[PDB]
Write a protein that binds this ligand. Structure first.
Ligand SMILES: *[C@H](N[C@@H](CCC(=O)O)C(=O)O)c1c(COP(=O)(O)O)cnc(C)c1O
Ligand SMILES: *[C@H](N[C@@H](CCC(=O)O)C(=O)O)c1c(COP(=O)(O)O)cnc(C)c1O
Lengths: 386, 386
């Protein structure tokens, strides 16, 4: 009836695939490169680099920081994160030996709690990795006040908020790097795909290098990694300079991404209209609280949190929902801190408490928002959730 | 041109791509699952796990060893590798904090020098990662003799030797794990693609988990990682237990992969016919040494090494081969140890020396072999390399 996922494609995505077939160049090329230019232009960054998925976009984002001429991050370094996000926002911190400090979320915005942030910040903090949750941007104004010129890097996992903006700027472009995802279920889809954006050329060349074999084949003759490239191909083409990966996207995802980006503004427009109608139907709801928007959210989906002491039990709504053909799931993955089994591999600490994440973990659920008009579905959802 | 790589595709892989487009299901699924099954069966391994590339296959191979119930490896352990190979054979080792011990290669076979190895193996050696170079398998009988019952893990990077055999056993299936690549220029091509095979179910379950977010979704109800999966999918489907990645292959790659396996034997045969031909044409070549075969090479390509005391300058030969429109390159990456820049990041040492690797690095070169008859390129090559 009402799924969490619908297809974003049309004839056009298919044609783009044909175009690629007909070219007989399958691995990362023209399209991918064209696609990166469009992406950057699209969100207002100087550079964009396409990878195999948003997870690997997070991996290189952290990785790159260790290979700047003046390494910006080091093993043991303290990084702050919020307690609610996708797993692969965290894994990379572990794989790089960072010390992780979790902070609770604000139960209204579902983003990192600001007042906890303020106090959680110190002289030991090297970086802050924010996540724009469910399409909702962090209030970067306040985040910038809290950092206050200190050597603390700001990073964004924007895998759920493509299109969101805050004060006339695209989410994802506030940090030194911002990551995106074009996985099937996201604002657009290239089957799998992710992207890192940055206005830093140094970081930009490093990303080009660790994305594919740690080589220099995709570096420009004069570049910020090696500096000046020899002209002996026999030579230059087989020099390895950073311990990277092969996380190249396929040409086909680049081509398909070109088509989706064209459609994006409409997708976002439809999404917001549905959000507007949704909020109208659900405000002053007797036992559910909705997400409070910051800036202009790209409304990835619709979260609900059971009102305190309303005596409503999640299992029930859950049943209700499914019995009406409406799919739902926890919000993102609930409180990450409960995954104690993977947590045993981390060097981590919890600032103050994560009561909010905890409450969410037991009392929130989520239903999708899509790029097609869902007025009908919402009216029904509201009939079911009364 | 006498290109280094060729299309192994015909209307079939084109048809398979079609079928997946027809299914409208693009994310890792049944084709991939089907391919994994065909793959293990083809190479004679109990299990196979398909990943986004041979490089991420090597990464997961190392990563798995850390998450076994009783860790097979730990930070600081020593692992012995050969000095000639693709850079992604080495990175995982640095990324996981292993102590890398380089060993010289045998100048004839181009694989690890067996004498050096016996000597390089010590009480501290926990594992040995072999690479089967250019289609040619390592003498695993000699290798197993060296290990002789001790607790030393044998691994293989088989990304260049899909289809080689040794004692009628398939290469890639001697070590606790073996990696494969199905990248454009390799034996089979699924655009990008890699696989890991193993006979160990626990490692096998660990791979299924770390390939996709460290979740439990692709583990069987009763499994070696978590035991028994819960029935409440609301919880079970968002449980994270090991620090993995998103290195899932594409369904299209799974589908193209299945047609490729069907054609393998033929590829191998032709490639081997080409090689024989090349052999006697180059049999008594006055100034160039050719690669010594162990078992049945899959002849990924043909190496040439300017004889000791010949007065021949590598430069000419290339000049020469380039003027003739024959595509040429270094043997893999040459002496990997020449990359001092990336070496800065490793915790490593060198066994004795790697003079063979350096000789090859300065006097070695290589042209590609294909699955179409090339007697004519050959005759021509011979003529050019007089
Ligand atoms: C996307 N999270 C998805 C995971 C879907 C999947 O199987 O990949 C979800 O179900 O919520 C996401 C990522 C991962 O990007 P990727 O899916 O392209 O690997 C990273 N960060 C965030 C915050 C995120 O939502
Ligand atoms: C194959 N190496 C290829 C590299 C092709 C590429 O650019 O990806 C070559 O040109 O020699 C290879 C790999 C890399 O696996 P992948 O290419 O599927 O990521 C890893 N190990 C070895 C030994 C290898 O030959």
């Amino acid at each position: 009836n009402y799924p969490l996922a619908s297809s974003t494609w049309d004839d056009l995505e298919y044609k783009a695939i044909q175009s690629v077939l007909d070219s007989k160049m399958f691995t990362m090329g023209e399209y991918v490169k064209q696609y990166e230019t469009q992406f950057a232009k699209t969100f207002g960054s100087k550079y964009a680099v396409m990878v195999s998925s948003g997870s690997t976009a997070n991996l290189l984002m952290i990785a790159a920081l260790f290979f700047t001429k003046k390494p910006r991050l080091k093993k043991g370094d303290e990084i702050i994160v919020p307690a609610v996000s996708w797993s692969t926002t965290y894994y990379p911190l572990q794989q790089y030996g960072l010390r992780v400090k979790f902070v609770d979320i604000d139960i209204n915005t579902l983003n990192i709690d600001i007042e906890s942030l303020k106090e959680a910040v110190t002289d030991s903090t090297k970086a802050i990795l924010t996540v724009n949750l469910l399409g909702n941007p962090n209030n970067f104004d306040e985040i910038n006040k809290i950092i206050g010129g200190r050597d603390i890097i700001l990073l964004e996992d924007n895998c759920e908020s493509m299109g969101a903006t805050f004060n006339n700027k695209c989410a994802g472009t506030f940090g030194l790097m911002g990551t995106f995802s074009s996985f099937y279920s996201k604002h657009i889809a290239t089957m799998e795909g992710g992207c890192i954006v940055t206005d830093d050329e140094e970081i930009y060349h490093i990303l080009l290098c660790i994305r594919a074999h740690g080589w220099t084949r995709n570096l420009p003759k004069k570049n910020k990694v090696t500096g000046v490239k020899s002209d002996d191909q026999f030579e230059e083409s087989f020099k390895f300079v950073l311990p990277g990966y092969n996380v190249r996207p396929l040409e086909m995802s680049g081509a398909i991404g070109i088509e989706q980006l064209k459609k994006l503004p409409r997708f976002i427009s439809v999404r917001r209209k549905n959000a507007e109608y949704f909020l109208d139907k659900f405000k002053d709801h007797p036992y559910l609280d909705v997400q409070q928007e910051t800036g202009e959210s790209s409304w990835f989906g619709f979260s609900f949190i059971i009102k305190k002491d309303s005596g409503v039990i999640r299992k029930q709504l859950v049943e209700n929902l499914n019995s009406a053909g409406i799919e739902c799931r926890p919000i993102v993955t609930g409180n990450f801190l409960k995954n104690t089994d993977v947590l045993k591999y981390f060097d981590y600490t919890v600032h103050n408490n994560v009561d909010n994440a905890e409450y969410l973990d037991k009392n929130g659920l989520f239903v999708g928002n899509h790029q097609i008009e869902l007025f009908d579905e919402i009216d029904y959802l509201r009939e079911v959730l009364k």
